[PDB]
């Protein structure tokens, strides 16, 4: 499924796109490492209910493996992520969303595609450039 951006689905359930070989039933609690600086501990879980967020998520992610999206159930509250809320569109659309709590494993997506890869690289050059102009803000 070819992600349309700031398209929700009907479920209305909360995906979270990574690298990491997670399995349905896993517990997996805040304070990793983050994915855009080296040595940052995280405070929040970030999940989606956007394909198209939790595609960059896979895409994005630090690792070897390839891109997995998975389904995600919170065990406390979500807020808007201030990272993609009122930065450049008004609110959320991207419906991505952060918790301070864990987060249970319930399920995983097996049918989609990424995005092209000229768009995956502009993407990576995009953030590079931030970073080397040291404008890579990152909010957590
Ligand atoms: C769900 O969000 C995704 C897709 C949105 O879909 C889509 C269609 O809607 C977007 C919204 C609503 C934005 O508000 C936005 C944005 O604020 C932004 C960049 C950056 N794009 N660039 C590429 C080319 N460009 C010329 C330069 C920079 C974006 O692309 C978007 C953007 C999209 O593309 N930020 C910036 O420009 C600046 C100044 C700083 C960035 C800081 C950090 C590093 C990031 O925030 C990290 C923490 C992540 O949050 C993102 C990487 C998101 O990845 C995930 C997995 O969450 C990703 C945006
Ligand atoms: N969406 C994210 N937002 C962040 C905001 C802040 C900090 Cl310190 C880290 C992150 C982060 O690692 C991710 C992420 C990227 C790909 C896959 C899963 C999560």
Redesign the pocket.
């Known amino acids: 499924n070819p992600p349309k951006?700031?398209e929700v689905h009907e479920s209305g359930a909360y995906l979270h796109?990574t690298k990491a070989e997670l399995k349905v039933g896993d517990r997996l609690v805040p304070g990793r490492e983050?994915?855009?600086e080296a040595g940052r501990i995280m405070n929040h879980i970030?999940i989606?209910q956007?394909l198209?967020?939790?595609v960059?998520?896979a895409?994005?992610?630090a690792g070897e493996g390839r891109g997995r999206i998975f389904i995600v159930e919170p065990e406390g509250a979500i807020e808007d992520?201030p990272?993609?809320?009122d930065?450049?569109?008004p609110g959320?659309?991207?419906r991505?969303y952060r918790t301070r709590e864990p987060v249970w494993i319930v399920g995983e997506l097996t049918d989609w595609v990424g995005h092209p890869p000229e768009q995956l690289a502009?993407?990576r050059?995009?953030?590079e450039?931030?970073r080397r102009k040291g404008?890579?803000?990152?909010?957590d």
Do not use: H, R
């Open positions: 951006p700031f796109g983050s994915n855009f970030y989606t956007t198209d967020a939790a960059w998520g895409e994005l992610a992520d990272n993609v809320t930065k450049k569109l959320n659309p991207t991505s502009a993407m050059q995009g953030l450039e931030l404008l890579a803000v990152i909010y």
